């Protein structure tokens, strides 16, 4: 690659330090035409540093750029919860070669926390249209990995769910996850017990939330 950024992911607790590296295939222009960016979901990337070490406006001094020629480093000291983001270097390698590194995810380390679990039945409105979505919410947990198992009258459901996970929260450093089970109205109304079973490092044993179709 013209620009090799490593590692893919780096992690520290609040107050800690993370180090991100970028190596260009040939020396960048003026030996220091290298910038660093921070990007959060739904946003354009934000310039942190240009000219290898020069802080952009509004950027705290705890973001430190160093290096020259082909070898550059971003050191983030005094890590904050709001540093949870993906970071990119960008280089000008002369000959109009402008290129980005592949990016580095920064994970803020945090005390292990179990999810709070909620299950939601399909709405009557949706059922009228012939489809039933059943939703299980896993709220505010850490670390990211979690397992959801759907059961319908104790039959394990497979291949009919999809899940989505939020970015790490900028304040409390947790994740949340939603899982959606999709059935036809006809299949939904043929069964009683709907259960969401959750496995996570913060749980000594799986947590199950359930409802009985129709019941209050």
């Amino acid at each position: 690659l013209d620009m090799t950024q490593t590692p893919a992911s780096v992690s520290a607790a609040v107050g800690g330090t993370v180090t991100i590296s970028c190596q260009s295939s040939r020396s960048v222009w003026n030996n220091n035409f290298l910038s660093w960016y921070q990007q959060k979901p739904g946003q354009p990337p934000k310039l942190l540093i240009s000219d290898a070490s020069k802080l952009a406006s509004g950027v705290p001094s705890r973001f430190k750029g160093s290096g020259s020629g082909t070898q550059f480093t971003l050191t983030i000291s005094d890590l904050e919860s709001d540093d949870a983001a993906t970071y990119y270097c960008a280089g000008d390698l002369s000959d109009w070669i402008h290129t980005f590194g592949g990016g580095t995810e920064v994970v803020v380390k945090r005390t292990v926390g179990a999810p709070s679990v909620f299950i939601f039945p399909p709405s009557d409105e949706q059922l009228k249209s012939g489809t039933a979505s059943v939703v299980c919410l896993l709220n505010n947990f850490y670390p990211r990995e979690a397992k959801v198992q759907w059961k319908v009258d104790n039959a394990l459901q497979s291949g009919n769910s999809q899940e989505s996970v939020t970015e790490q929260d900028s304040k409390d450093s947790t994740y949340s996850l939603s899982s959606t089970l999709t059935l036809s109205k006809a299949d939904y109304e043929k069964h009683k017990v709907y259960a969401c079973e959750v496995t996570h490092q913060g749980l000594s044993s799986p947590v199950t939330k359930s409802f009985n179709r129709g019941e209050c």
């Binding site: 000008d92 402008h98 679990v117 299950i119 939601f120 249209s129 979505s133 919410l137």
Partner: protein, 218 residues
């Protein structure tokens, strides 16, 4: 200093789309302007840039498929014969990415390359209950189902409610339509008193929906 992008949206494969950026708080003709794209879940990729004289340079992969131009007040990117591989968020960025003048970027606009039709969402309640409350705290939300293309935005109580809100990334369903949920945790003792309304906007279909979410009468 601000860049405002426009011109994105849905485009049929092999078609042609053009994106435009204008500037606020600075004089756009005084700068190089770059275009950068980012495919869903992927990294940043520099497409090309254009100098103050109107001379453009491109990444090797981008040549012939992208055209960058400018006027005294605008800079534009034309996408030639798009495939599904060109589906991405496109940014206009001042200068070049390594340069100190690249501190100003447009918000980014999604280009979706697809033959499929625009479709607005249905919005369903995720109602609070006994299976949805723990320790005095309940959860509720909205299921925003079956829309195309991205994006949708969700607010609660017209932006007055932000604490404890989680709006999930959309999932592409096997039907080819998107779905997402937005949830919020609230006091269970509030469920009878307080009003909770999710405000859904799907600008691609110019669809707006307000859904009030309350415990189901059972």
């Amino acid at each position: 200093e601000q860049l405002v992008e426009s011109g994105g949206g849905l485009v049929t494969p092999g078609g042609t789309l053009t994106l435009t950026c204008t500037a606020s708080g600075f004089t756009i003709s005084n700068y190089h302007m770059s275009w950068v794209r980012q495919a869903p879940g992927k990294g940043l990729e520099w497409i090309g840039f254009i100098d103050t004289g109107g001379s453009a340079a491109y990444a090797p992969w981008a040549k012939g498929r992208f055209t960058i131009s400018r006027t005294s007040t605008t800079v534009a990117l034309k996408i030639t014969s798009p495939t599904t591989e060109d589906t991405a968020t496109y940014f206009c960025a001042r200068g070049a990415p390594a340069w100190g003048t690249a501190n100003v970027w447009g918000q980014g606009t999604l280009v979706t390359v697809s033959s499929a039709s625009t479709k607005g969402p249905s919005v369903f309640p995720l109602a609070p209950s006994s299976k949805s409350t723990s320790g005095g705290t309940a959860a509720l939300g909205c299921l925003v189902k079956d829309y195309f293309p991205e994006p949708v935005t969700v607010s609660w109580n017209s932006g007055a409610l932000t604490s404890g809100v989680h709006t999930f990334p959309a999932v592409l369903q096997s039907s080819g339509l998107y779905s997402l949920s937005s949830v919020v945790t609230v006091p269970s003792s509030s469920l009878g008193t307080q009003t909770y309304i999710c405000n859904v906007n799907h600008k691609p279909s110019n669809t707006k929906v307000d859904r009030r979410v309350e415990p189901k009468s059972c």
